[PDB]
Structure 1
Amino acid sequence: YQVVQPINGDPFIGSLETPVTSSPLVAWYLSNLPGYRTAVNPLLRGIEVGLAHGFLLVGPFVKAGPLRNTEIAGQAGSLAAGGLVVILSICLTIYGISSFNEGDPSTAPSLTLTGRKKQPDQLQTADGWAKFTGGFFFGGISGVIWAFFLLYVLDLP
């Protein structure tokens, strides 16, 4: 009995299967993250990603920033997280513009791990990527706003 096996049975594809890679807990969790919802409209997945990340970025900017100890503007240091959402959204946009042309099909895999034919994720299309970028921007600005809306009754404001 051995825990490590080749990836999907093929020992000459360069990888391995471990509790870290192929595990029911891990496979379910990764499968239930927005990026891995291949049939969903990329705009909604971008909404979720942007909401989570934009919400996250507020913390370090406010607590570690230069105005951190001037509580009058230190709280308002969330503008910086907003600006980073802007810059990241630029990076996404030029990534898609550079990566996908107008009429090209998805570059995502069209097979499953078990060999059956799959429909490829539209995220890897020019239109799908543009939708994911718009969703990440909207959700990101929105998540920053939501985090900034809560200044109260938290052990680390």
Structure 2
Amino acid sequence: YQVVQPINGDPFIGSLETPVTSSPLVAWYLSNLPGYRTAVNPLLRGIEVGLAHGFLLVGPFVKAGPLRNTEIAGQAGSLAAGGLVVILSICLTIYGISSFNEGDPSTAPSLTLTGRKKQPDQLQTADGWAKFTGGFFFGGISGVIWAFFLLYVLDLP
């Protein structure tokens, strides 16, 4: 008995199957992250990714920024997080402009790990990525606003 097996039974594809790669917990959890929901409108997946990251980014900027000890304005350091979301929404935007063209189809795989044919994820399409950037921006600024909305009764505010 052995634990490490070739990637999907093919030894000549550059990868391996390990508990980190191929495991029911890892496979399910990654299959349930919004970036891997290959049948959902990319606008909504962008909303979730934007909400999670915009919410997370507020913490470090507020607690480590220059105005951190000047409590008069340190709570407004979420603006820096919001500015990074703006910058990242530009990085996301300019990425799709160069990667996918208007009439180009999806570059995502049109297969399944079991061989059956599949409908490619619309995220690797020009309009799909545009919806994801718009969703990430909307959820991003919403995540920063909602994170700054909370401030009190926390051990590290």
Q: TM over 0.5, yes or no?
A: yes
Q: Which runs of 5+ in 2 are unaligned?
A: none
Q: Cα offset for 1:76?
A: 0.6
**Over 4 Å off, 4+ runs:** none
Q: CA RMSD in A?
A: 0.2
1:46 paired residue number: 46
Distance between the aligned counterparts of 2:146 and 2:93, measured in 1?
24
TM-score of the two chains, using structure 2 as the length reference: 1.00
Unaligned runs of 5+ in 1: none
How far did residue 108 of structure 1 move?
0.1
Indicate the SS of the match to 2:93.
helix
Number of equivalent positions: 157
Structure 1 residue 96, shift from structure 2 partner: 0.1
Q: Deviations over 1:53-95 (max 9, x none)?
A: 0000000000000000000100011000000000000000000
Mapped partners of 2:95, 2:146: distance in 1: 27
Q: Deviations over 1:9-47 (max 9, x none)?
A: 000000000000000000000000000000000000000
Matches within 5 A, 1:24-39: 24-39=24-39
Q: Cα distance, 1:156 vs. partner?
A: 0.2
Question: Matches of 1:39 and 1:151 in 2, distance apart?
Answer: 37
Q: Find the counterpart in structure 2 of residue 19 from structure 1.
A: 19
Name the CA distance, whole Å, in 2 between partners of 1:57 and 1:102: 32
Give the structure 1 partner of residue 91 of structure 2: 91
